Paper text:
The eukaryotic exosome, which contains both endonuclease and 3′-5′’ exonuclease activities, plays a critical role in a wide variety of RNA processing and degradation pathways. The helicase activity of Mtr4 is proposed to resolve secondary structures and remove proteins associated with the RNA, thus facilitating delivery of single-stranded RNA (ssRNA) to the exosome. Although each helicase exhibits unique features and accessory domains, they all contain a common core structure composed of two RecA domains (domains 1 and 2 in Mtr4), a winged helix domain (domain 3 in Mtr4) and a 7-8 helix bundle domain (ratchet domain or domain 4 in Mtr4).
Recent crystal structures of Mtr4, including apo and RNA-bound forms, and several related Ski2-like and DEAH/RHA-box helicase structures provide insight into the general features employed by these helicases to bind and translocate along nucleic acid substrates. For example, conformational changes are observed between the apo- and RNA-bound forms of Mtr4, including the ratchet helix. Even larger differences are observed in the ratchet helix between the Mtr4 RNA-bound structure and the Hel308 DNA-bound structure, with the Mtr4 apo structure occupying an intermediate position. These conformational differences may arise from the fact that the Mtr4-RNA structure only includes a 5 nucleotide poly(A) sequence while Hel308 is bound to a partially unwound DNA duplex with a single-strand that extends past the ratchet helix and exits through the base of the structure. One potential implication is that recognition of a 3′ poly(A) tail and movement along an RNA substrate involve different conformational states. The primary base interactions in Mtr4 are with E947 (located on a loop above the ratchet helix) R1026, R1030 and E1033, occupying one face of the ratchet helix. The direct protein-nucleotide base interactions observed in the Mtr4 crystal structure suggest that the function of the ratchet helix may not be restricted to RNA translocation (by analogy to Hel308), but may also involve RNA sequence recognition.
Author numbering: 79 to 93, 95 to 360, 390 to 872, 875 to 942, 959 to 1007, 1009 to 1038, 1040 to 1042, 1044 to 1045, ...
Amino acid sequence: PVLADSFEQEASREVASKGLTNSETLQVEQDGKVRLSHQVRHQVALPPNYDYTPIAEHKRVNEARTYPFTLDPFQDTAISCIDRGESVLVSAHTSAGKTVVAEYAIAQSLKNKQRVIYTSPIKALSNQKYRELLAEFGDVGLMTGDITINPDAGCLVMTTEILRSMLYRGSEVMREVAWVIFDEVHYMRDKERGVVWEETIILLPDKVRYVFLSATIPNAMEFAEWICKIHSQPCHIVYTNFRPTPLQHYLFPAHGDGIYLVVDEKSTFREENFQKAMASIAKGDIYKIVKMIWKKKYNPVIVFSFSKRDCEELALKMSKLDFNSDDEKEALTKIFNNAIALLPETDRELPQIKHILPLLRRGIGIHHSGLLPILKEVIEILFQEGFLKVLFATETFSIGLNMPAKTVVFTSVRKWDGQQFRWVSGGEYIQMSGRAGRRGLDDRGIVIMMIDEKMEPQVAKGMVKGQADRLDSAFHLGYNMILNLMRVEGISPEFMLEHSFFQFQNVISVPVMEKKLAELKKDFDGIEVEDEENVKEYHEIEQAIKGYREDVRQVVTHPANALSFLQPGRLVEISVNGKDNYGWGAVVDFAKRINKRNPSAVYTDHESYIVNVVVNTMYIDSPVNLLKPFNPTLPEGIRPAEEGEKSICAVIPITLDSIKSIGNLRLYMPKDIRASGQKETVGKSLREVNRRFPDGIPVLDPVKNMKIEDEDFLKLMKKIDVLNTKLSSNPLTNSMRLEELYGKYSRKHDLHEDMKQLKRKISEAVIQLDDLRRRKRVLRRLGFCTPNDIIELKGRVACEISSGDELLLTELIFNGNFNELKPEQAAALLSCLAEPLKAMREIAAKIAKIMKDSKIEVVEKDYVESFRHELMEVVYEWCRGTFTQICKMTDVYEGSLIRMFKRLEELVKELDVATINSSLKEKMEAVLKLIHRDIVSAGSLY
């Protein structure tokens, strides 16, 4: 395919505000308004020799849909693609200003008595768009699993999954369908729902036209080419950095009194205001800012926290304040109780609505991942109406609601993940902050970023003036899809892979690699070194030496030997993960690693113990306030200081792989921790000891000190002497150029091994094929036949898609006909004293030996513990019947229930797809009755 018709256009709007500062933010226009611009870029991907007319030159004859306001060029061009009948992709921020474009496509379809599909990811947003489209268009139709009404329609709204099935099933409506409109296309990078999007598209007919709707996305021109490649047709892209109601961006430093406009409505980076801000460098800070905003009247606020545990402590500490808005509570309680009575009664009690309602009263709440879907949409409507003024809410919203604005306040600048404490990304920042600002209802949206760490200009420039995450494919070959590939005709797995966006992105990367591997092949074949033959043998010998003593380190540093040493004060040589030398330090303590985020986790012998060390070589700006206990993942920003930087004393966690050597020395370690100078004094002792051994600290001899006398060990040391001989005995007896000719050849060798690894990434769809090949090799040993056609067992999967592992579950059926009180062991596969949990584990490892036999991933415990015993006895007791009792048996939020209830249940119950093991199909309808009625009519529409 071919790229053409590229152009940028400028556009500018008018709004004036001083906001949260002392001065007016922008140089003012006479009206009291402010002239602000935004750019809007377009290009098209065209098929070879396609007769194209430049979209700028186009004139629409017949306005399908007509609009009251002046359209924007980001809109106006998309609409001319649609009217040229040329697929178009639009990314802009969720002003949902995109809607204008969709509305046009629809109306254009129905004007032509054609049919057109509108897909969103989620059943709910299907209803919301449905109601919206219904009110404007009439013959609209809704297809969820949940709801399905007037399908004999011309405008059909369906979940993305619906469509997937329909393309796989009878391409039925499809025949009359002109345009398919994908909302929230950026969801395709999701590791989960992200394959649905890709698959679906891939399936679709080269003859249907597309309208893609995205949030802003860096490279989307890679997306259109793909469409232009696989549905052989023109695809336009339409991007804008437009912001519906401009944003302002403050840092609130944590000593906490002054507040600094850091990025403007341009976005001009207020560099000076910033460096002022960093200079003025944590519970109560938040209250100060909470009160401040209700007082400064930037009225409703989402206070983003990254954990559930934070949103709950911080929403209640502001439940002291706005217990007012209570002449408003003289109205609130009523639509809030439009609910609790709609409940089952026993499931209407409990610490559920308890608490909550003062916060409701006090114009406040929290935001789940733990509440109830109605508990949260009452809130969402409480937020819609602004009855709640501060919701202490979490990163993650229902994918994705509509939310009140004016005020967005990050409680932080960092995110955990077990545990990197890492900076918010460019991407994360745009989404979360994207919530501040309301159309018309706000002359500006406000972003306030509680910072608490010295942070470089280019770091924050990346975070506050960054871009959104790449759309990168999330495709991969799952079984219950391979089968469906196999069965229905015309459509090979091998056709899917070659057609995936994934293999596409990979296809583009290859000329990229080539240009550099060809750029590196000029440079390795550019460095020529004298007596290369003589240098080499010398270079290799020194490297063989390098490699053996590494083997030695691995022994010493091993927990069988090391641990018996290493008392507080032990001197240790730190090179963490091999790249961060922090030199000598002293042991504070150590501990068996306790991986809490993952129960069934396995660690190396070296990675299995965590060591605390005082080092004094720590870069001074390292946010050492961030590293957590016995968690040797050192946050980005925590580095050792290099030649000519300032240092400090810190206590860091390491693994035994971070240890370069154990000294034969112990200094004094205060058991009084790092308490008020205690770690600094040790810092002075390290300074002393490091000054007392400039050359180095005497290392413990493995043999004379550590009683290490393995036969295997000694032979290693012997090899070392053997080399050290041949090496010394080399005619680079101080060759006067030894450091010059080594350096010259080492660069040659470094570039050589690097040209190898880019020679490998290069040349290799041919990557995805193996899992395909290997999944069939697994599959044939089971349910598909050996010529790769679907047999019986591949009926006991292929139709599923909601598989809690479709193959361990298909295999337990044709084997284990249990009782009634014990088969709640589906908790073991769908949640992520008398036990039949060995029947799945004896069956798994065999299945997992196959997955090992067909050369896929791993059997060993990780496949066997892939199916979790953790909450196996909890969901087990629920099979015997209170809602309030079961919640006393462990520690999982009451929102984990309506998911896993509908996730352990929806696993047991879609077995639609036409009959039979009798004893199953009956004792299991019972299995479905003993849990549904305990929280009966799930029921949740709006």
